[PDB]
Amino acid sequence: GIGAFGLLGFLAAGSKKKNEQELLELDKWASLWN
């Protein structure tokens, strides 16, 4: 009804620039290299 998918985008905004989660997501990124 509200839209929890809106915070998702904002969450990614953080990844752009502290949190284990963001780090876990970054790992998957670098994972590409590996």
TrEMBL record:
This is Gp41. It comes from the Viruses.
